[PDB]
Amino acid sequence: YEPPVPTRVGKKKKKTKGPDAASKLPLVTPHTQCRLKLLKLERIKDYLLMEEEFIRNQEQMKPLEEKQEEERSKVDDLRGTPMSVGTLEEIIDDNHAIVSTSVGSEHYVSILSFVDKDLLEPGCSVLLNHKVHAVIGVLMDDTDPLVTVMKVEKAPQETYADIGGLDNQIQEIKESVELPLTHPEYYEEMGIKPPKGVILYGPPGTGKTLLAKAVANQTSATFLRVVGSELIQKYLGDGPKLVRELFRVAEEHAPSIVFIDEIDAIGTKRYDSNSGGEREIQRTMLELLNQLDGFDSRGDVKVIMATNRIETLDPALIRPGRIDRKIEFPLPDEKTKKRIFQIHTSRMTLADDVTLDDLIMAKDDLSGADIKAICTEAGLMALRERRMKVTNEDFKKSKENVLYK
Amino acid sequence: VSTAVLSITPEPNFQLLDNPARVMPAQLKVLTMPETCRYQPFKPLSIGGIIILKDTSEDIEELVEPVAAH
Amino acid sequence: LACGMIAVGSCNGDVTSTILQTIMEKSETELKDTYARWLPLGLGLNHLGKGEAIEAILAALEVVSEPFRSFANTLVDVCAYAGSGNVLKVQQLLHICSEHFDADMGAH
Amino acid sequence: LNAKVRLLREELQLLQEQGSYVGEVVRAMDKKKVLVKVHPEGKFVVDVDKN
Amino acid sequence: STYSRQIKQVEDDIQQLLKKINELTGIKESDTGLAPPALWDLAADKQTLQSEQPLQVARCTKIINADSEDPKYIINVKQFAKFVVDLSDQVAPTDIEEGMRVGVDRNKYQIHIPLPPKIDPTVTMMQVEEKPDVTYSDVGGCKEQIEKLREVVETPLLHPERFVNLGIEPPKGVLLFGPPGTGKTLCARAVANRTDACFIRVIGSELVQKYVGEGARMVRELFEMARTKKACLIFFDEIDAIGGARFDDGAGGDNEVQRTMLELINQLDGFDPRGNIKVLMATNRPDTLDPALMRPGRLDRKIEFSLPDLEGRTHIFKIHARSMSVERDIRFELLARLCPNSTGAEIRSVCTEAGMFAIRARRKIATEKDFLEAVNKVIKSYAKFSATPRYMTYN
Numbered sequence A: 001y002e003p004p005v006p007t008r009v010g011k012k013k014k015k016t017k018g019p020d021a022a023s024k025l026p027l028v029t030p031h032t033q034c035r036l037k038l039l040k041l042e043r044i045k046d047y048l049l050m051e052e053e054f055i056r057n058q059e060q061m062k063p064l065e066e067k068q069e070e071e072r073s074k075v076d077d078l079r080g081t082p083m084s085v086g087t088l089e090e091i092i093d094d095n096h097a098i099v100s101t102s103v104g105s106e107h108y109v110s111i112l113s114f115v116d117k118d119l120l121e122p123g124c125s126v127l128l129n130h131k132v133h134a135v136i137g138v139l140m141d142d143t144d145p146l147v148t149v150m151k152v153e154k155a156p157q158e159t160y161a162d163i164g165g166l167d168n169q170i171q172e173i174k175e176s177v178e179l180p181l182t183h184p185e186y187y188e189e190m191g192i193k194p195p196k197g198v199i200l201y202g203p204p205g206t207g208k209t210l211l212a213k214a215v216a217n218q219t220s221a222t223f224l225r226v227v228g229s230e231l232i233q234k235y236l237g238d239g240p241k242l243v244r245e246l247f248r249v250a251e252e253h254a255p256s257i258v259f260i261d262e263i264d265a266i267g268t269k270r271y272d273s274n275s276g277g278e279r280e281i282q283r284t285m286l287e288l289l290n291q292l293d294g295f296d297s298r299g300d301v302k303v304i305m306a307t308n309r310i311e312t313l314d315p316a317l318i319r320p321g322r323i324d325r326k327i328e329f330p331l332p333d334e335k336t337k338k339r340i341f342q343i344h345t346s347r348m349t350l351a352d353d354v355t356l357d358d359l360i361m362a363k364d365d366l367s368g369a370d371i372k373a374i375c376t377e378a379g380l381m382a383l384r385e386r387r388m389k390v391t392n393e394d395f396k397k398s399k400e401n402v403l404y405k
Numbered sequence B: 001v002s003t004a005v006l007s008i009t010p011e012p013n014f015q016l017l018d019n020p021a022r023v024m025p026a027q028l029k030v031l032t033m034p035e036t037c038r039y040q041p042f043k044p045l046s047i048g049g050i051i052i053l054k055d056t057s058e059d060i061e062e063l064v065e066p067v068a069a070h
Numbered sequence C: 001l002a003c004g005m006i007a008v009g010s011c012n013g014d015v016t017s018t019i020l021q022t023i024m025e026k027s028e029t030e031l032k033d034t035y036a037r038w039l040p041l042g043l044g045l046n047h048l049g050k051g052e053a054i055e056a057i058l059a060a061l062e063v064v065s066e067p068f069r070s071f072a073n074t075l076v077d078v079c080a081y082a083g084s085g086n087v088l089k090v091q092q093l094l095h096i097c098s099e100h101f102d103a104d105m106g107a108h
Numbered sequence D: 001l002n003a004k005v006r007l008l009r010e011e012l013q014l015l016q017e018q019g020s021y022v023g024e025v026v027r028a029m030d031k032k033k034v035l036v037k038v039h040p041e042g043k044f045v046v047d048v049d050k051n
Numbered sequence E: 001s002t003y004s005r006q007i008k009q010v011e012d013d014i015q016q017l018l019k020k021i022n023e024l025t026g027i028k029e030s031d032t033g034l035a036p037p038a039l040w041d042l043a044a045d046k047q048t049l050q051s052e053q054p055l056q057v058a059r060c061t062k063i064i065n066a067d068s069e070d071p072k073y074i075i076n077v078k079q080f081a082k083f084v085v086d087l088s089d090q091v092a093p094t095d096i097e098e099g100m101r102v103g104v105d106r107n108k109y110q111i112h113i114p115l116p117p118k119i120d121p122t123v124t125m126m127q128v129e130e131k132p133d134v135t136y137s138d139v140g141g142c143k144e145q146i147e148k149l150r151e152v153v154e155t156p157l158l159h160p161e162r163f164v165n166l167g168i169e170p171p172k173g174v175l176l177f178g179p180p181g182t183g184k185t186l187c188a189r190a191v192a193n194r195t196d197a198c199f200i201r202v203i204g205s206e207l208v209q210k211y212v213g214e215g216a217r218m219v220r221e222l223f224e225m226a227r228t229k230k231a232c233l234i235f236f237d238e239i240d241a242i243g244g245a246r247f248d249d250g251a252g253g254d255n256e257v258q259r260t261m262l263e264l265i266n267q268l269d270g271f272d273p274r275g276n277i278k279v280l281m282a283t284n285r286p287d288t289l290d291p292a293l294m295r296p297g298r299l300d301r302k303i304e305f306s307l308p309d310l311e312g313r314t315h316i317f318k319i320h321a322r323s324m325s326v327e328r329d330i331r332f333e334l335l336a337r338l339c340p341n342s343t344g345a346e347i348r349s350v351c352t353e354a355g356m357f358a359i360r361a362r363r364k365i366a367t368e369k370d371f372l373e374a375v376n377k378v379i380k381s382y383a384k385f386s387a388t389p390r391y392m393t394y395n
Ligand SMILES: Nc1ncnc2c1ncn2[C@@H]1O[C@H](COP(=O)(O)OP(=O)(O)OP(=O)(O)O)[C@@H](O)[C@H]1O
Pocket: A162, A163, A164, A165, A166, A203, A204, A205, A206, A207, A208, A209, A210, A211, A306, A307, A308, A329, A332, A340, A343, A367, A368, A369, A370, A372
């Protein structure tokens, strides 16, 4: 006896996912409505006419058994009903595989011809005949709930115009997560790949997450948001597993932007639910190191990290190649404070006795979050008195509310 | 179809039934021989069955040739 | 094959005439051999990419016995329209491919 | 009363017809298919009755 | 615009034609894993469904009376049962051994086909099937390191005849160590690109498992499936995730990870021969590795990826600025002199930031001033976040 030899190279499925399939018509150039585009379109049309006539003839003199609807009905009969859902454990041969049913019992069954053999990889969910357990299909796995958790379905309403004073920071982040997608020709003509990673660091409330929201508003790439503390799991190896799956999902929806917000919180916070102590956190960090810049080839995945404690991060995590740009978000100056106050009171109906110049120096260490909280709480005080116009007394109470106590 | 053209390139209201006539039980009430025929039935033609026919004329007798059993 | 390769795309009269003479001199059973398939090819190589210069050649090939005549005609016609993108000739070729035969008759 | 008697006699044959599994629907699919999870028996891709 | 009406007419005709074609041929479903109908061998599928019976996977346990002509085989059919069966007439008695997986029928459970050993799918995916896009030409300043790595991990596989003749046993283990960004994983990717044998990439964090003994099981299965190949390479990136030194801290501090590391060590050099596996580990913290793991016979070669010297930094600058639209008189030697202790990653970032400075000024060519500003921004301004000064104490 000799073991079977597969004809397919490797054991993994085809990398390409969600293509145009048989509708991959040749890209006709130029897009301008000229006679050359017209001639190329006519040529495609003549080839389609010839194809249509040939296929019609062949199906015309094909036997009654061999017809498209008849062959589909025969495929349905071969599959039968119900179609059990098992797990592809191993691909023994091109048309033979070991599959395990839901009851944990394995079977050496045959893969039928109509199965999409390039969709078969170990661990993939397959559909088997109920009686003979032969592989009759591959089940398109439904989106994981975790896939839904990361993905930002609706773009945030905060735009770059809602950010005041962070001109240089906006430029630096646009050069790394927005310009490479909108205008890749700059980078291609310059002969450089775009800056790989970006980390936004600064005191709390300075606008790091606001800039990430603005990026997510004006991005054509899938946006995945993960808090650093979410990477701390309750079981050993579950942290590295979560990081690995997060970047796998990022690779699936390429191009994508991975926003690991509050990354330092993975290390600055210790929870007793974490079975492993600092060592499991270190293993999770090593997995993150591999994902950021490691052996596996990375697609069109951009990583944005934010933290108010960058001194607590492992320096190998933010090393160049993993995080190329380190964008600092300083506490706003007077011009930026005035811009922030005008931004957050733009929809407000301020009173004539309210001046933003006095509020500009409510505290020396005033941030954008403090200003927004001042405005929101002043509006709340106006709401308490059943008013739509916010008075200077409302802002005065706001300052003693949010900043103090 | 040829090659694709490329870019360049009045029931009647009565019926005469012969003799013998396969007549329905319902047909009897609606069946009556033509008036001008040389034969006239003894019983009403709606009765059915074997009917003797009075002969008005004494011309040649155009009888019915018997058929042979299968 | 050689004489076609020397005179590829040249429409050489001598090579065409001698290839036609060799083709029609062979017996019908002799043409069953697949090496005879090379005789039109060189002929086809003679008129490679020439286009509508094969009509005289096709008329000459009409007298050849079948099914070798269909093979030779298809070969020379294709070689004449090689690298031209003429959708009409592709339509003719697909019409030839349309009618399938239940091998010997289906060589072309 | 006769309908009651007839239904009673047919009920004996009906009760011998095998019972139906109870499953949870994961998602509907094309061609009137449904991905279900039978209570102890994992997942299945089942057809849908015309009714 | 004069052709626009005809453009849209022919485009709609083409779309209708494509839909019509797809009507007769196929291309549909794709959620139940259906192949295009052009690949449907339905008659052969029916013949397979009838003739080719399904086979349940069991494990042979004991052969009774193997010497005589009636050998009985005790098989353990997974979660199903345990049976005493006999081989089918189409299987040689010497083709079934104790402890190996077999496939049996559902009627009499007679052994019908010996089967490959069970391997975890996560272990199976660890083998590299798409080689990286990095060659040895993309690593600068590591001439001696690359030569030492190649003469261990590539030369014995390429030309074994040069070693057997002289009774020479080549080293079977390499540890690449150095500060972050120095090129350990880059050289590993170059090896995987150039190699022809089976290459398996293992990240240490992937060997950490929830349950007790699972990481050791993954290591065992990794070396089992590595032994099913004539020649194999295993890459252990960031081996310090599981390769830490054994210690006793009163409690069970890192006991399971130490057991995983011990299993890896036993596979590398234990009672049983390792095989033709040539392992390769990269770490930026080699001081934390266990002394038994850092021992010849498990890690025979210790290649240090120290920071590049002046010539190495100039070579890296040339490598990363090769496709740059630089000016004519870029003094790359001066730039290499301006960053004394800098990793290759910092040099790549310097090149990228010089290009970004040129792009931001709407210029298609990066001047020397742009590279100087890039050096200031990367080497100097970002030096607060440099991993270099802390990590050369570890290396
Ligand atoms: N420069 C700014 N201009 C305008 N609004 C700002 C600015 N900085 C902060 N804000 C406002 O403050 C809110 C809260 O700030 P944000 O969450 O972005 O800060 P952060 O620096 O990411 O803080 P943390 O470190 O706490 O995560 C934002 O939603 C935004 O409305």
